[PDB]
Amino acid sequence: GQLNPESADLRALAKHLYDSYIKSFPLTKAKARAILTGKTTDKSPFVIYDMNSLMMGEDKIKFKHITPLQEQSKEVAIRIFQGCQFRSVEAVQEITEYAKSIPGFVNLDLNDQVTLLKYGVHEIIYTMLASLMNKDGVLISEGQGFMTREFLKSLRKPFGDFMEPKFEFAVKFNALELDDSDLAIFIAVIILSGDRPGLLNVKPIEDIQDNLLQALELQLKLNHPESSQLFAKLLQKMTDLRQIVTEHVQLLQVIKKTETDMSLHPLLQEIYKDLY
Ligand SMILES: CN(CCOc1ccc(C[C@H](Nc2ccccc2C(=O)c2ccccc2)C(=O)O)cc1)c1ccccn1
Ligand code: NA
Numbered sequence: 001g002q003l004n005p006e007s008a009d010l011r012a013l014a015k016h017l018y019d020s021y022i023k024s025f026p027l028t029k030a031k032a033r034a035i036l037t038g039k040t041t042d043k044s045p046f047v048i049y050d051m052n053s054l055m056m057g058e059d060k061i062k063f064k065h066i067t068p069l070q071e072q073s074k075e076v077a078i079r080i081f082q083g084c085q086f087r088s089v090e091a092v093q094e095i096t097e098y099a100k101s102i103p104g105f106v107n108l109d110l111n112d113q114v115t116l117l118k119y120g121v122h123e124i125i126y127t128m129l130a131s132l133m134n135k136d137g138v139l140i141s142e143g144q145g146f147m148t149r150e151f152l153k154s155l156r157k158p159f160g161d162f163m164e165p166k167f168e169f170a171v172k173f174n175a176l177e178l179d180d181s182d183l184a185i186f187i188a189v190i191i192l193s194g195d196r197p198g199l200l201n202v203k204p205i206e207d208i209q210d211n212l213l214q215a216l217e218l219q220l221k222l223n224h225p226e227s228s229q230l231f232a233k234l235l236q237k238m239t240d241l242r243q244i245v246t247e248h249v250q251l252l253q254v255i256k257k258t259e260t261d262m263s264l265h266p267l268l269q270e271i272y273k274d275l276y
């Protein structure tokens with residue numbers, strides 16, 4: 001390893017992605033970790049750990065008009081469902097904005113840009129969800145609230161099955177101890193996946209991702225001394241991300257069967273429309 005024009009170009013690419021990452025995502029992992037570990041921040045999230053604390057902290061969740069005469073277990077799960085829906089729609093906007101700053105991305109054919117984002121957003125959502133998670137729960141509303149793992153698991157069937165796979169993923173993923181500069185390149189690697197179904201021009205996508213993989217490999221070398229095979233371990237996580245997406249779609253399908261009075265936002269519809 002030597003510091004030559006090629007390595008300096010990979011370091012500049014990493015910095016450009018970090019900067020775009022910082023301006024596209026308001027709550028970074030560094031900020032979330034400070035909150036979660038009790039460092040001094042401008043945030044003190046209200047903790048939601050049961051139904052009583054959920055109602056007393058209704059402001060943190062964005063939900064529609066409460067349907068009266070509903071069993072309270074059902075009304076609570078609908079509030080959480082609509083709250084995650086709002087955040088997901090918001091998260092997709094942040095991701096598509098960040099993708100534009102990936103060098104070469106907007107120059108790809110627009111059909112392939114849509115395809116890459118269609119298949120990548122949820123993998124990235126779950127990657128960055130881990131940044132806001134510890135073994136106790138997840139930060140919500142940009143750090144204004146904290147919803148516990150066990151409360152999310154206690155929701156009425158089948159709502160209590162949605163978050164658990166993300167927490168299982170997150171505790172293992174967070175043991176890699178990646179930071180925002182690592183994550184900015186990693187999510188770009190996810191977006192530039194040449195194996196998405198229906199891509200027109202695969203070679204330019206693979207060429208960009210090859211450049212991103214070089215940058216990510218160098219980033220982990222410089223940022224994680226004595227961390228053995230972190231590059232390979234991180235790339236293997238992408239397989240876990242895809243299983244989570246698949247498992248999640250099948251959970252959404254049982255609600256489309258089980259419950260009316262709970263349609264999905266048209267954007268999430270547009271994304272899941274013919275997903276695999
Ligand atoms: C847990 N959480 C943080 C955000 O977590 C996300 C968890 C998942 C997602 C992906 C997103 N998921 C949903 C989309 C629509 C409706 C429900 C969900 C749920 O996933 C869900 C379903 C049932 C019960 C609980 C959740 C997607 O498919 O697009 C995006 C964000 C909350 C919770 C309440 C309010 C806001 N923040
Ligand atoms: Na799998």
Ligand code: NA
Nearest residue numbers: 239240242243
């Ligand atoms: Na898989």
Ligand code: NA
Nearest residue numbers: 249252272273
């Ligand atoms: Na669907």
